[PDB]
Amino acid sequence: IDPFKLAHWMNARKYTAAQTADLAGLPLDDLRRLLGDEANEPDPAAATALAEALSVEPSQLAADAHRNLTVVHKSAEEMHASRRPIQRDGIHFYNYYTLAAPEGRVAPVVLDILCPSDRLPALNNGHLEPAITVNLGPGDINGRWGEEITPQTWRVLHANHGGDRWITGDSYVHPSYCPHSYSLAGDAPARIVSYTAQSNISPLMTEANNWSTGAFEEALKALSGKVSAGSVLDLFLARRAHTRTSAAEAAGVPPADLEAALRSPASETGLTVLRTLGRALGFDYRVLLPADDQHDGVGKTWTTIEDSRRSRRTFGTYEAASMASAAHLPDLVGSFLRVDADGRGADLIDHAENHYVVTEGRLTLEWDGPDGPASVELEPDGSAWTGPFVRHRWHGTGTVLKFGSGAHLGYQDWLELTNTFEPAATLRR
Template identity: 40%
Template sequence: MTSEVEIDAYRLMHWMNARKMTPKMVAKRSDVDFTVISDLAVGQANKRISADETSRIADVLNIGIGDLVFENQAAPDVIYMSKEEVLATCREIQRGGIHFYNYYSLPAPQGFIAPVLIDILCPPDQIPTQNNGHLEPAITINLGPGHIQGLWSEKPTEDTYHPFYANKEEDSDWILGDSYLEPPYCPHTYARHSNEPTQILSYTIKSNLESFVNVSNAWSDKSYENMLSTINEDAFGGFALRTLMERHGYDAETLGKRVGVGDNSIPSFLGGDSTALSTDGLKKIALLLGCDYRLLMPNVKNVDRIGRSWCTVQDSRASIRRFKSYTVASMSVSPQHPDLMGLFFKVDKPETKGDLDLMDHSVTHYMVTGGNPIFRWEMPDGAVAEQSLADRDTLWVNAYVRCGFFGNGSLIKMGNGEGTTYLDHYEMSNTFDVPGALRRGRHDTSTWTPINE
């Protein structure tokens, strides 16, 4: 029996447009019936064709077969997972010869990332066995009730082996403990600080560097080292400008003359002096080189010696505020990880009154930490659905779903960039007629040239 492949019409159209090839060209060069290609091109349902035909089309477009295969990426608006369902995902982690952690998964659709709930089991009299770190950044919260002894280096030092505190005060019913963000490849491991049991909630998200790492893994070692030798992390704007000047054929003298800045301004900027060029000067350079001037500006950092960003219980408490119909308190945030966030959330309002007053631009996770709030959300047909919640019940909520909580309770809210990332916002800010481009791009199967030509 001949194996078949389901072709994704949108992917096929994308690659035909990118390669500037018409359906007739693809049909002729791949020896696949023109009606198959044209039916896809006018937006008819995804078709199953033979693996051999798929391979021939992929060869013509100079892509892999996987670039054409249909994957059902439809995601629900909301996923509810009870405490019992979360506990059923338990898996034991052995490390250093002992039962080290229990891991539990929170809900997410296939292909999406979800936080994990972790029992800390390493005893307090033992230095915990270290892990190797990972590319993906993460936010982690001590849920209590006990403190944690954390280690963020291979060997304990004063600033890398210290407590990670739980909240022991009256507001521990909703502000549970310290939180922090960890950078890529930061080793991290945890033990109990005393015999008191404790848990963490950790959200390890996809790194925005992942696609670059995947692409650059195909480079030669020499090319990769050439790239690393050009980077100046402490003066990234200068590094970025130097790469653009190389790309567009300018040196410091010719660029300075074209934009009318002082003789030493550009060499100083390239050397690491971020104040050598004014914002107006950077904008002039951006117009000349066709770049986003914000890439050349110095970034803001709030990290410690090893790249962590901390928010203590006291910091969270100091941030308490009203937000719409809720009381909230901040967790750790960092300009280095704009998509990664957490929030302590308190609900105290009538069960039957109030608007659906929440709607996030990216995926959101909620875990109930106390009480019995009610969650309501607007479904695609406009009807309002409802889910009663209890302690340690969890929710996954898709981007731009209008929703709200009612009654009484407390939750932890966590989010990443699955939906709209900060990089997407940058791209939107640079796109002409953003609404028009996005409307046209949704499920677009238009070809770049008339279908029969």
């Protein structure tokens, strides 16, 4: 039982501790203790009786199985032992291996690319999640993103043949739902990492699936065409039983200045008009500003070896180079990291989760956890996961790939945290 969730539902019903206990048929002392992160109670407890009393499903009071996780790690031997062949199109098409992840969560995947160069690789179905895909080498592979073979649907993801093999190969971001597959570009073997992030539209979709079909169709219509500052603003105004005319009046804004602002929301007139309207009507103007037009090719995010080389920089004690990124997918990140020292590692603290895989060297990952300082030694194909805000560092001489994903803190939490009075106190509270 999550005491945060229990307290929330007691407050929602306006029941006291005593009333909740009586309603549920439970000892009060047990409920007072349940308001205390972990004790023994919950399991043989009546999560069931509390659920019934508070008119919720038992899972709405359930505590997460992860508690206090900081770091999870998986040795090269364990990774190799995870191997699963995938048959497709009559052949042994891939091997797939799982990297470190908390139990239950989505594990990053390494694939052996086994479809030969003289067979067109049969497509998969696609998936909601966006992914960063990087070629580990040693061989070039073909990427396929469509039925028909064209420059837009078939392109070589090169492996690095040169020096600076800590930059392993080309990378790109796969768009949501695009079917994809890979074959070898020639005779040399190859592996890839495919790293997915959480879809941030997933919570919406989950709820929308449960809407009536009528309401679903109305939602789609609302979202069709270009989703512009104007189309969005008009839904905000309808929400508040306003028209463009009444809204402009309430905010002290001339009609023509609102129209001009909707034509160029990121202009100087634009931002000030929208902000003045948001203040007056109770909305956040930031969500009306432009993001980039979208482009469903892989051309825009595609990142070559040479791109990554040109990106090289010192990052504390590390050397870093960029993998592909997409400004429409702010919570998905990938970097190549070169490590080169025995102690004194620059502390890494990230605002969400990391997944790491070692590609060269016997590296040491250190962290500060609930039991004090902790460390693990990882060889190539060894991997780790770090929770948000877990302070850690790498020592040794080697290379690691650093991936990042996570809803918390993600870019949508950032937007809200900027609207929050004293966010740190709220969290402490």
